Design a protein around this ligand. Sequence first.
Ligand SMILES: CC(=O)N[C@@H]1[C@@H](O)[C@H](O[C@@H]2O[C@H](CO)[C@@H](O[C@@H]3O[C@H](CO)[C@@H](O[C@@H]4O[C@H](CO)[C@@H](O[C@@H]5O[C@H](CO)[C@@H](O[C@@H]6O[C@H](CO)[C@@H](O)[C@H](O)[C@H]6NC(C)=O)[C@H](O)[C@H]5NC(C)=O)[C@H](O)[C@H]4NC(C)=O)[C@H](O)[C@H]3NC(C)=O)[C@H](O)[C@H]2NC(C)=O)[C@@H](CO)O[C@H]1O
Ligand SMILES: [Zn+2]
Ligand SMILES: [Zn+2]
Ligand SMILES: [Zn+2]
Length: 389
Amino acid sequence: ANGYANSVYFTNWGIYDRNFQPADLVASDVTHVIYSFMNLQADGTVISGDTYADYEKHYADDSWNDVGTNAYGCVKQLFKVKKANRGLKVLLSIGGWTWSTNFPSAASTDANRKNFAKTAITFMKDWGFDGIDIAWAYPADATQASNMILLLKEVRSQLDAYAAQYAPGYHFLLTIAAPAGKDNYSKLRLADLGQVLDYINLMAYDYAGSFSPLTGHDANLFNNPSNPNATPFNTDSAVKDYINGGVPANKIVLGMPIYGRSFQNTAGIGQTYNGVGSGSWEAGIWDYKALPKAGATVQYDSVAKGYYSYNSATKELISFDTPDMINTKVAYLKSLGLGGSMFWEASADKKGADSLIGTSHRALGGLDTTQNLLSYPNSKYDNIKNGLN
Ligand SMILES: CC(=O)N[C@@H]1[C@@H](O)[C@H](O[C@@H]2O[C@H](CO)[C@@H](O[C@@H]3O[C@H](CO)[C@@H](O[C@@H]4O[C@H](CO)[C@@H](O[C@@H]5O[C@H](CO)[C@@H](O[C@@H]6O[C@H](CO)[C@@H](O)[C@H](O)[C@H]6NC(C)=O)[C@H](O)[C@H]5NC(C)=O)[C@H](O)[C@H]4NC(C)=O)[C@H](O)[C@H]3NC(C)=O)[C@H](O)[C@H]2NC(C)=O)[C@@H](CO)O[C@H]1O
Ligand SMILES: [Zn+2]
Ligand SMILES: [Zn+2]
Ligand SMILES: [Zn+2]
């Protein structure tokens, strides 16, 4: 990188009910789009979880009269975005919260690791992407933690060999989605991750929700010693442990949520609740663009650095990030020499001044301008190999 990352996860399932297509991305604000998620088999095989979303869906300008074997779906739409935004890199993300059960097996043998790297890189180079993001939630012991390093080294080795043959001098990126909870990150080979990876996407959110005994801030920076029940976690303790454990500050990208977590039948922050209630798309989760809801007021914990809405009438509390929160988090990350901002996920953002991703772009100042790759001479898709020319 030659500047800060401003990266966003784009979900392939967002093309359905959320109706958020790659052309809806405000691409001018983004250095990296992390395309989520590929699924994984126990033998290391990386697979599409949705071939329609990935490469079959025909958009308005996609013709069934094209000759040969061609890519459509989000793959062609993202290649269009890359052409129009030469500073924007697209990463292939594998796993995620719901598809991490097969990682231990996938990383467990030389054969499975070689099959993971080959199948992942096959998608990357056929689809015209710039790298790979591993989202293993989460390595659970020392065997898994060390096998995770062996898997990353196999992917790095195969990426370099691929570039040597089919993109000489291009550096394909290798990243992970990393846990903010010490119970998980204490198990990782932090010094090894610091050496092998381009970036660690720190998932500095999901600190409180339905899994909590009490309500709490979802993504606060600091502990609040005068209301510690509101801050079961804090980002700052995680960031310091990652750097001191051997991850260089500039490789850490600070994850921020474009959604809020709701608690029902509660008095306030750091208190008892009964149930998380409804959501935008799933129980207890609200898209940022739906917040704050009518009848709720937003209050700031200036010690924990966290905003939340409360509706006295409905006894509903929602923890979420505001533009001011992004400005505070960007000042924080710059103060520690971190690599930039990451967002989960693109579809829920507001447009214009109130955009969290746009707020971050403006607060960061100087973004990574490293050029993406448009040359895929070994793609099995004739339109990708021809650069959609
Ligand atoms: C400090 C500490 O230790 N805290 C612990 C805490 O971390 C733990 O909570 C977990 O944390 C991790 C981070 O560490 C979370 O995982 C990351 O963060 C994001 C946001 O949470 C994750 O995002 C979720 O990702 C899953 C997929 O993995 C999403 O699942 C999708 O759900 C939708 C439904 O909304 C499905 O969509 C439908 O799809 C069909 C077709 O397939 C379509 O036809 C429909 O129209 C479509 N429509 C709708 C309306 O949905 C979709 O199929 C499915 N996709 C898949 C692949 O299953 C889910 O929606 C995302 N959640 C939010 C919110 O956006 C993300 O996985 C991961 N990021 C990365 C980069 O890895 C994790 O979410 C969180 N867990 C929980 C349960 O919240 C907790 C655990 O208990 O413990 C604390 O101690
Ligand atoms: Zn539907
Ligand atoms: Zn590198
Ligand atoms: Zn700029």
